[model samples]
Target: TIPHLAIDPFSLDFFDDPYPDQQTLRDAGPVVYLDKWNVYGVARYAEVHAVLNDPTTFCSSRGVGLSDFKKEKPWRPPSLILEADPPAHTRPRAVLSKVLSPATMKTIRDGFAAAADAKVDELLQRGCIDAIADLAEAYPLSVFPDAMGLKQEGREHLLPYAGLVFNAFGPPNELRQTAIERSAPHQAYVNEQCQRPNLAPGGFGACIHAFTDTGEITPDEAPLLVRSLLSAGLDTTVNGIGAAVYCLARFPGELQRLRSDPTLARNAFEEAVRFESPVQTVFRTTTREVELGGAVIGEGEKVLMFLGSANRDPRRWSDPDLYDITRKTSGHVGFGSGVHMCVGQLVARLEGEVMLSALARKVAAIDIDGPVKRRFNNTLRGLESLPVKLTPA
Candidate 1:
């Protein structure tokens, strides 16, 4: 029989620090029934990875949240890709796969790199800054909107909108309630920006709209596709960059290594993702009664896969807690795995690489100047404020 743990994973206390509970969940069994959420929690690497890869059995179509879409109305429209299964998910995924391919990324790389260099130059003048507000959030906010060809007037809403989307995955708690209230305006802005005429030519948003001509997707679906980009693109990268900065601040040796070999910038960012996964948890629903780890889970049961915990599981990684840039991090579940794995991850990696590379070239070392504060979202793991004093090389 699977262990039944009475813990609220979405509570503020759990969100603040999850490591201890993660260990307990993993130690309990491959699948533990959480009485608080009435969901089965999978914390080990093997089980989590397996669940993520087998989308057929553990479907995402029922809604990737504690709330069942079939039983309850969704907070908003379901994601065309993330909240869908095969056939329905196939077309949108194909369209986005082409839109965000390596060829497309290569075209944006040099421009993104130049922007990163300029941002770093400006940060060096300040010397002391909050990594979250100054660099992590600033870099993405500056470039992503332009890349998507969005208007400059209401770009500030992007983060809050993303927060609301991620938070909705958890149970309807105070956090979810507050996010819903605060995100209304931002959500409207995003919806408006996704329209064809609102997007600038030669941008990713325009390209998504262009797919309508090929009959791959309808004119109506274009904006929703663009909405997908907006919701997943910014906040995930912001937290990823913040996680890298936090890792480097605590691990000076790795920072020195990155500075000496600036090429390791990409690896460092990936390592940080493995060390401190930004998107921590994702939910999947069992399509039918199934046996996992010798325990049977009934049909339509919600299963929470701990991406952050699996990234640090001792059975899968040697010295899983260490922040070593050289480690083989390909299998880590930071960007997730399987068909529903983050399609925007390539873009996220490019942003992380350019920013970290620029920092390596200009800043000699990152020193923590004040207390670090964490941003507690129901699903994302990131710093709210990271104060740092940069030393010039």
Candidate 2:
């Protein structure tokens, strides 16, 4: 049934707008066996969260990539923390989480905020800006390089590297192939930069190597963890910032509200994450035979949790389709849930808040000059181009 519907789970027209298809799949049953790929689909809010939080029941050690780690060779070692369970996942996560702690984040806040504000001020002075490339992409590229302790070698390469890694989660298709070819030249440089001495001192990359020095993690495992940061970190916030800007432009009232109170930048970020879900789908494997909504999920089956769908689940949200900044969306699956949740969420939040706040404080009104272009990847839902005119207050 699933196979006849679509050969690739990501190929559905619904892949672009999955809410309705999510409803259909969820209503069909809790665990729908996608016939095309012969995998399970966990489309609802309740079941998806349950699968993500319960790592024991939904093991990630088989590799988070589409290939079964026990059966096929992984592209590289799986993320030590993101792909491990229990005791194995604990230490690295703890070590990395500390580097992103509130105090450490606070220390960098002023610098990042100033950078964001300066960029906004610059754009406002220009009277127009491509928010995605200029403001949204600019802020993170500036701060994250410094934060990661990277000396400015291949600073421009982060986006494509992150894109390749994220797209690799789906089947080996044209998208994956394209990213591979595009990233081949820079892959070696990226791998080499993950080393200890190569890292910029006093940055998160240095801190990751510090874990190895202390024997918290092995020297071999250090690079993989750093790779996780490099993979998951960069391109995500760019689209997130773009989404927030696109939302405010589309919804003038909300934008007005945010401009009136810059503090709402935090809510605007969270709200956009919930509404658009930059990191859309995540895979979880079934540990044992389990019944979900009367359907059986056999052991070792993969489940694609449609996070974008879950965020808009009618059972969970009042106006599921509406984008409301005022919504109480603290628990949205945008950053994911449970133990495997995003460790660098604070970094992402700070980036989004600073950039958005900077724009709101400086610009009087931001309007779209033309239509927005969407960038499609199996794992991430993002914008390719977002055109806007910024008018200063």
Name the candidate that leads on lDDT. Answer: 1
Per-candidate local distance difference test: 0.92, 0.81
Worst 10 residues of 2 by lDDT: 1-10
Candidate topping TM-score: 1
Model 1 backbone overlap count = 0
Give the lowest summed-lDDT range of ten residues in model 1.
Answer: 7-16
- Per-residue lDDT of candidate 1, residues 296-324 (tens digit): 99998999999999999999999998999
Error of 2 at 135 (Å): 2.0
* Whole-model lDDT, model 1: 0.92
Candidate 2 clashing pairs, residues 3+ apart or interchain: 2-35, 3-35, 3-36, 149-200
* Model 1 alpha-carbon drift over 4 Å, by segment: none
For the record, the alpha-carbon RMSD of candidate 1 to the native fold, in angstroms, is: 0.9
Candidate 2 Cα outliers beyond 4 Å, as residue runs: 1-8
- lDDT per residue as tens, model 2, 186-209: 577678888888888888888887
